[PDB]
Design a protein around this ligand. Structure first.
Ligand SMILES: Nc1ncnc2c1ncn2[C@@H]1O[C@H](COP(=O)(O)OP(=O)(O)O)[C@@H](O)[C@H]1O
Ligand SMILES: Nc1ncnc2c1ncn2[C@@H]1O[C@H](COP(=O)(O)OP(=O)(O)O)[C@@H](O)[C@H]1O
Ligand SMILES: Nc1ncnc2c1ncn2[C@@H]1O[C@H](COP(=O)(O)OP(=O)(O)O)[C@@H](O)[C@H]1O
Ligand code: ALF
Ligand code: ALF
Ligand code: ALF
Ligand SMILES: [Mg+2]
Ligand SMILES: [Mg+2]
Ligand SMILES: [Mg+2]
Ligand SMILES: [Zn+2]
Ligand SMILES: [Zn+2]
Ligand SMILES: [Zn+2]
Lengths: 366, 343, 367, 213, 366, 214
DNA sequence: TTTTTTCGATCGTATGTTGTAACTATCTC
DNA sequence: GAGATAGTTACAACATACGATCG
């Protein structure tokens, strides 16, 4: 193997592929990048038996085909420490790899590439293309609702569903539900899959805000994403994600239109008043009026009274401050709409204009 | 507080559930079986969540309270399981349990597992509050006398033909370890599809995994079974128990025997037992020992015990087990050369 | 070259493993009848076949033909498992990685379906070295395992594991390999390797193995090295004599029969190997005490001293108790007066001579 | 003036006093090619454990090949004599006994040797290793890579777990005789051109117990 | 006795006073802090028998003169808990002290003031004042070489020497030496003293770059530093310090002048493959040539070539890269001058621009 | 300030040490012939001058004039060592530094060249008080340390030290001072100090000393 | 209806909490 | 489009709890 590239070209792919790698791997080889030079291009591969990141760089200088592995952190540090504009020439001799840059020379140990694990080839089922903004919106809308750590595996991941010409993301943790939907523009067969938390984080980091569309392929148990010159492959957690439509309220007889900024200020004031853990905050809504009282154990309660647009009968209910605060923060608009049936029942929240994003919160018993 | 045993819990579960369940005892197998039965019945009745927690100083009670107060979207009637520490709840844990039972809800089903509470521990505000609407199952490991009946019942429940010799061998090898005995029965049933177990068949697939305590060793010495005492001592040594505990356990009984023998010359045994508040179940055994040992004996034993204590606590010697074995043989009716006594 | 005799002859079929009949029969019946537990725990002494049996079970639990107790050994899964590079077989050395993070990651990995196997088997070896938090995580994962995940555990000190983890798995305990089976296995291996041997050498090697086939194979390899490509009685006897470290019992046996030259030879041999004299003296005291207690009751001798059971039992049977008492007393006096002797070796020799051909005069209460 | 002990460390199997059995076994093993991957050496202090270990390591990595009679002149032999060879990883277990050190050592054992045919790890004072360190080495000792050999030296083998003792070939070194010590001292003094008398050598040999150092 | 003050002014002096106090007082008196209202000011003093910190705050509101002790932890909790803008009143009622923290009244125990072990009479052997910038520069440039924990207790501190008209700071740990000197414009007698490392760290943290000058007094057994309205008193090691003059090499002949940035970059790049445990490097010096070599336990080698102005004979010398990097970082100069004599002698480092500060590194003999 | 006679009259040269003739002769011969060892262990009863001998040997090794058996006592190195502030002389109170961490830190600084002296001397006082791990850690470096470091060990209970350490050190046994030597030293000190005395009092004090000068 | 341990000094592993410094992202010049 | 300030993440140091060995 032999090639020569520039520092700037090779700086970013190394950072991208070095993300998943870290800590102490189960096998030493998993801690090393795999470099393959062939067909006038250099491919860098990094995997941990669950996710795989592949980057490609074009070569405009004489080279030689080959393949070998190299430690990740040391190579990245060597590349980063060299001065700007330096040209890196890499070659392989014996069991060592020589990296040269100006008057600087380095030799690094390597391992045979025949032992490097590779994900088995699979046939895709649903293939499509999306703008980066659409996926960013979908993930950011339905990410905080995932369960941080639970015995139920399906709650950890996120549910990606394709239905007709609509792409839907669902995230729940047993106490909150978040559903978002957007139109892709083309019709796809009905199909739902579950992606793990690591895959979601990798997809979020993959997007850079550019105009390059990303191509998504979904198969039996794997998901692959192409973004420019980056290929990200991940496995799908098996299970049965709970259905989201049924848990939605059937017919909320009570509606409430509220100002997002005023609600945010009131909830912030309650949290400052209710910094003590345990219990939440009780809201009593009456005709065009709302009262908020902090029911933290026995701290002094300063009731907050505000004016809203409510038409139903008066009703009081307790809620968790953090859940409602996060739901409100997710909807970054000026006014919000809340739908509820009774004190003991799930409440739905959405924007006054856009119904694409919806949230469901189950009240805590007072 | 409805008190029950593992052998009759099923019927109660068929009758109906309750706000909380207490599983107090020492045996792990009985506690696990009761927990599994309760969980299965609750799941059949419509309980879905199975939240579990191990009580520890680092445990966060706020999360437990939030779970007890919050409600799930597509689930209801969650179940909570607590694993108490071996020592038991302290004042802070008592107050935490009081708060938890104050927040107890009808839908929530509470299960507690751990060792039996002492006289002080069992008397607590939370325990008293729970007693009104609680069912407690006592899971105590059966003693040697009752073990053969339990083994026969378990074998019959599994549709196995167990011989008297096989039952005795299983009792001897796996005494004090019900989990090992149950696993051995399962392995034997798997080995032989016909289910007919004979002495050679069980013998070929049995090892030694007995578990004992110092009190068993002291009782064996008092009764006068040399082989049983030696086996118990070897098992305890292999387990890795501290000899000082054995010495202290034996000291009280030896001193009591010496005092009774000195005072038994001109006083009936019953009066002395009443004065010393000797437990009824032990009385006869004690008397037997007091009749088997002469007055010249119980003085050499004290001398050997003192010498062993001094060797352990001053010279830090490692020959304590040999001296313990010698003293065990001395307590049983044996000559002993008296050179080892170093009198 | 020639690999290693132990590493080369690892069993690859249920018919090759020698002994442990009950465990193999139970596993075969369970696989045949479909009764498969969610977790197994293999226990026993060192070098008895725990890892070998675990690997055989894993191979037979994912064979292409089907779940069977006699895996083909020719399909892709069997070959890859033999090479130790199978995708689904996740073997973890718990000793090297005991922290909570590694176990957390490994247990989180279970959420994915198997790639090319009906089961995804985890083979945790040396489980007793895991941390407390690692045990908690393993228990949390193992309470409600998936249907396609199986756990195989191999350990040598099961008592270290918590009761909760023990209650969730079926435990199989292995026994010692006995002399005859070890001898037969060594004979078969040497016949396959085309190496000359003598029956007495193999008998001595089996006796020295002490219920551990790995130790027997290591000693056989060392003897082959010493014997210049062959096993001979003289070479093996010399090797064992060099490795022999039971001078205390031999000294007691020589002393009890009133032999002087043998005692001197044993003392010289003990001096050749770095040994603490006081340790030898206390060992002899312990042996005499054990013999006396065995004479008092046959049940005194426990299972721990199985290697030298026969000789000690014979000594207890033959030697009158009074001689044992006298030897114990004189050796106790020797131990007491050892630190003031001109030299440790000279003091030990003097005490041995006194116990051999002398008799102290007791104070005999005159008044 | 370099001390006599350091100066006169044996550099060949012909320069070792006594220890006939271990030398014969090692020579036969190297000649026949039946080479194990784990050797343990036991004996009293100052009887030539580290010396023979280094001699064996030099014999394994000699340029001429794997022979029981290393040349002692090639580059590998010279570097090992000077104690700076790259493929002879010498570890002082007494100084580094924590488990994390063992983990770090084992994390990078797959890499091929830099220049030699084998990468020999020589651990000294093994009995000082912690229990976790002992347990961490079991799998590696059982099935190490084909290009890795472990050499262990200790004074009290009874401190090691039985599991480790069953994985490695054990060699026990015996205390040297008085006559051997006297002959070695006479030879060394003759080489050093120092006046001596038979009585002085006899007294020194008597007062040296069995350790030549 | 009675005094009312705003929370803003009171907060921060209390934090500084409570700084030295730890969780374990080990004595009833040391746990508390001494508060003294005198004239038109309040002084809060806290000591741990080793270092004393006293703060003075001018009070304009009416107050009753007095002197007592109050627990530090209770007062800190009271002052921290109150909201913003709260006015705190305190009054000594008999044996107890009543604090009107907002609308909540708190009671604190009071102990006699005569039992507080605080210095009363101070005698200064030398005394002066200087801007905080000079002290900060000296401490920052000399502390990194100070020892942390060693058998030689006299090396666990910093040596301050008032010589003629200048002040000099010396630090060492037996492996490298750092010397700095600066004039102050005041004639002082020759006087050398040792300050423990903890006192040096506390003094360094005390400085904040304020324009107000810092006053320094040194007595027979104590050193006092006054900044603004804060006074910090510490004790001295009293163990004698070796003279730095003999440590410096005599008549160094080989001189290398190089660029600071180039040397820093070369050393940083070479340190990547340097042994982690020892961090050793080799330098080969030839005519206008500096070759830096680093090795790793697994035979990973790094080489660097630098062009400098050298005219002496060829040399080879080992070094510890960490010390060199620390010296270069602390130097903060454009050009670096290194003076050396042989391959086994100490090497001096300074900046060609000025000789105000110097450093000495002992080679790592292998 | 005032100092007791025990510490004020500490010998400063090889001519101020009473008895121990064999040890002094061996040290002088070794220094003259150039046969310098890297491990000296002074053993014996208490109050005989093990520490003084070790300090004198260290002073002789690091004298400006050169490696001599008769230190000048006036150069900078000699007076610096006398004051106890010499950089390259590391005096380690083993009775208060028994933990393994301290020994490991000590052994990691052995690869650095000496600051000003030609040797780096480690004087360990009461080495018998160290833990087993400390001894095992020392063993490796003590067997074959660098060429610029010397180890000096002083103890009164050589039995505590493991045989492994004793096998790699030069052992010097100090005899107990006789009554005549103690009496001579006492009368010399009293005459130098201008203190009246009588022969019988000195004889009684020498007899009661039990062979210890301290 | 239960009952039940010697102490001091030293070494090693794993987890949780707090403080300081360096790197990256965002806002204003 | 570049520099300065603030916020977030990573590394090092300190504290607590549990287990094991020798005198
Ligand atoms: N029953 C057996 N039959 C044949 N070889 C065996 C047997 N048991 C152990 N061995 C030998 O022991 C080695 C495997 O060790 P093993 O017993 O798996 O370790 P452990 O049981 O201590 O986990 C192999 O080299 C193998 O040849
Ligand atoms: N068999 C031997 N032949 C020659 N010299 C020996 C022998 N054994 C030990 N020595 C001498 O002992 C000294 C130290 O040996 P060493 O390597 O420390 O052995 P160990 O590792 O057993 O302590 C050396 O200087 C060496 O000359
Ligand atoms: N040989 C000697 N000659 C003169 N004085 C001695 C001698 N040995 C000991 N001393 C006196 O004893 C005091 C303490 O001696 P010390 O260094 O403690 O010896 P050790 O280390 O053997 O106890 C010294 O101050 C010294 O005056
Ligand atoms: F291979 Al083992 F105990 F020696 F599991
Ligand atoms: F180095 Al040794 F016994 F002292 F092997
Ligand atoms: F200082 Al001493 F014996 F008292 F060496
Ligand atoms: Mg195994
Ligand atoms: Mg050695
Ligand atoms: Mg002294
Ligand atoms: Zn197959
Ligand atoms: Zn060679
Ligand atoms: Zn001098």
């Amino acid at each position: 193997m032999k090639f020569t590239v520039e520092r700037e070209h090779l700086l970013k792919p190394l950072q991208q592929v070095s993300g998943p790698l870290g800590g102490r791997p189960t096998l030493p080889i998993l801690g090393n990048l795999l470099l393959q030079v062939a067909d006038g291009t250099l491919s860098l591969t990094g995997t941990d038996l669950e996710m795989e990141m592949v980057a490609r760089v074009a070569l405009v200088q004489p080279h030689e085909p080959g393949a070998t592995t190299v430690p990740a952190r040391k190579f990245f540090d060597i590349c980063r420490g060299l001065p700007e504009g330096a040209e890196i020439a890499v070659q392989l001799e014996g069991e060592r790899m020589l990296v040269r840059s100006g008057r600087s020379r380095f030799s690094l140990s390597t391992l045979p590439a025949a032992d490097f694990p590779n994900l088995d080839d699979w046939q895709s089922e649903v293939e499509f293309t999306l703008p980066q903004a659409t996926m960013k919106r979908l993930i950011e809308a339905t990410q905080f609702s995932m369960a941080h750590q639970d015995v139920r595996y399906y709650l950890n991941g996120m549910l990606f569903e394709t239905e007709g010409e609509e792409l839907r993301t669902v995230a729940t943790d047993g106490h909150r539900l978040a559903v978002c939907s957007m139109p892709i523009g083309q019709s796809l067969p009905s199909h739902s899959v579950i992606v793990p938390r690591k895959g979601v984080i990798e997809l979020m980091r993959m997007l850079d805000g550019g105009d390059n569309p990303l191509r998504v392929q979904i198969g039996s148990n794997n998901i692959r994403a192409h973004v420019g010159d980056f290929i990200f492959t991940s496995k799908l957690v098996d299970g049965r994600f709970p259905d989201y439509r049924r848990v939605l309220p059937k017919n909320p007889d009570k509606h409430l239109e509220a100002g997002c900024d005023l609600l945010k200020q009131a909830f912030a004031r309650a949290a400052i008043l209710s910094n003590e853990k345990f219990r939440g905050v009780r809201l009593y809504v009456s005709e065009n009026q709302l009262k908020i009282t902090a029911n933290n154990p026995e701290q002094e309660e300063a009731e907050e009274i505000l004016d809203v647009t409510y038409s139903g009968a008066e009703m009081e209910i307790g809620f968790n401050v953090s859940y409602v605060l996060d739901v409100l923060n997710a909807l970054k608009c000026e006014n919000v709409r809340m739908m509820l049936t009774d004190s003991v029942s799930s409440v739905q929240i959405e924007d006054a204009a856009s119904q694409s994003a919806a949230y469901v919160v189950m009240p805590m018993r007072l | 507080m409805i008190r029950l045993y593992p052998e009759q819990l099923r019927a109660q579960l068929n009758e109906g559930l309750r706000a909380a369940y207490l599983l107090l005892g020492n045996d792990p197998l009985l506690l696990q079986e009761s927990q599994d039965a309760v969980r299965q019945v609750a799941a059949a009745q419509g309980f879905e969540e199975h939240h579990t927690f191990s009580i520890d100083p680092n445990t966060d009670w706020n999360a437990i309270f939030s779970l007890c107060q919050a409600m799930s979207l597509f689930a209801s009637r969650q179940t909570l399981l607590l694993l108490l520490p071996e020592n038991g709840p302290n004042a802070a844990i008592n107050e935490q349990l009081l708060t938890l039972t104050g927040l107890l809800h009808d839908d929530l089903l509470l299960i507690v597992r751990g060792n039996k509470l002492s006289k002080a521990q069992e008397n607590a505000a939370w325990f008293t509050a729970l007693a009104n609407r609680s069912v407690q199952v006592t899971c105590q490991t059966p003693e040697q006398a009752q073990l053969p009946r339990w083994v026969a019942a378990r074998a019959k429940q599994l549709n196995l033909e167990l011989d008297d010799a096989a039952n005795q061998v299983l009792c001897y090898c796996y005494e004090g370890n019900l989990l090992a005995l149950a696993q051995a029965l399962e392995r034997l049933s798997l080995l032989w599809p016909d289910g007919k177990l004979t002495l050679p068949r069980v013998e070929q697939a049995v090892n030694d995994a007995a578990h004992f305590t110092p009190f068993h060793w002291v009782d064996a010495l008092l009764m006068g079974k040399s082989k049983r005492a030696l086996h118990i001592l070897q098992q305890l040594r292999l387990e890795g128990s501290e000899p000082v505990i054995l010495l202290r356990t034996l000291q009280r009984e030896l001193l009591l025997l010496v005092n009774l023998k000195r005072q038994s010359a001109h006083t009936p045994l019953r009066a002395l037992f009443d004065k010393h508040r000797v437990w009824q179940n032990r009385r006869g055994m004690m008397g037997e020992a007091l009749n088997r040992l002469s007055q010249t004996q119980l003085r050499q034993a004290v001398q050997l015990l003192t010498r062993t204590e001094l060797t352990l606590k001053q010279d830090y010697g490692q020959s304590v087990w040999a001296e313990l074995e010698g003293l065990s043989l001395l307590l049983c009716h044996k000559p002993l050369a008296d050179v080892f006594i170093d009198g | 070259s020639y690999q290693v005799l132990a590493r080369k002859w690892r069993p690859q079929t249920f018919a090759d493993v020698v002994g442990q009949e009950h465990v193999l029969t139970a596993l075969a019946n369970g696989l045949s009848l479909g009764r498969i537990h969610h977790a197994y725990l293999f226990s026993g002494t060192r070098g008895v076949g725990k890892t070998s049996i675990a690997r055989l079970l894993a191979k037979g639990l994912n064979c292409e033909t089907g779940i069977t107790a006699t895996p083909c050994g020719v399909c892709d899964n069997c070959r890859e498992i033999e090479q130790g590079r199978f995708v689904d077989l996740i073997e973890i050395d718990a000793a090297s990685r005991t922290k909570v993070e590694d176990t957390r990651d490994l247990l989180d990995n279970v959420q994915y379906a198997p790639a090319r196997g009906r089961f995804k088997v985890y083979l945790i070896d040396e489980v007793h070295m895991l941390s407390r938090h690692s045990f908690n995580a393993l228990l949390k994962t193992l309470e409600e395992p998936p249907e396609h995940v199986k756990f195989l555990l191999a350990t040598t000190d099961p008592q270290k594991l918590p009761v909760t983890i023990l209650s969730r798995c079926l435990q199989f305990h292995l026994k010692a390999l006995d002399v005859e089976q070890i001898r037969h296995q060594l004979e078969h291996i040497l016949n396959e390797e085309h190496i000359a041997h003598e029956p007495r050498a193999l008998q001595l090697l089996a006796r020295a193995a002490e219920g551990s086939l790995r130790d027997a194979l290591s000693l056989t390899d060392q003897a082959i090295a010493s014997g210049d490509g062959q096993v001979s009685t003289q070479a093996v006897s010399a090797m064992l004599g060099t490795l022999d470290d039971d001078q205390a019992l031999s000294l007691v046996e020589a002393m009890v029969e009133a032999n002087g030259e043998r005692v001197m030879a044993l003392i010289n041999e003990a001096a050749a190997r770095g040994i603490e004299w006081e340790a030898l003296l206390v060992e002899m005291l312990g042996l005499l005490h054990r013999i006396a207690m065995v004479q008092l009751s046959p049940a005194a001798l426990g299972n721990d001293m199985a290697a030298i059971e026969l000789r000690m039992r014979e000594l207890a049977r033959t030697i009158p108790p009074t001689d044992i008492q006298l030897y114990y007393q004189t050796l106790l006096i020797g131990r007491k007066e050892l630190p003031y002797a001109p030299d440790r070796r000279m003091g030990v020799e003097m005490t041995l001579l006194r116990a051999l051909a002398f008799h102290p005069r007791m104070p005999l209460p005159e008044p």
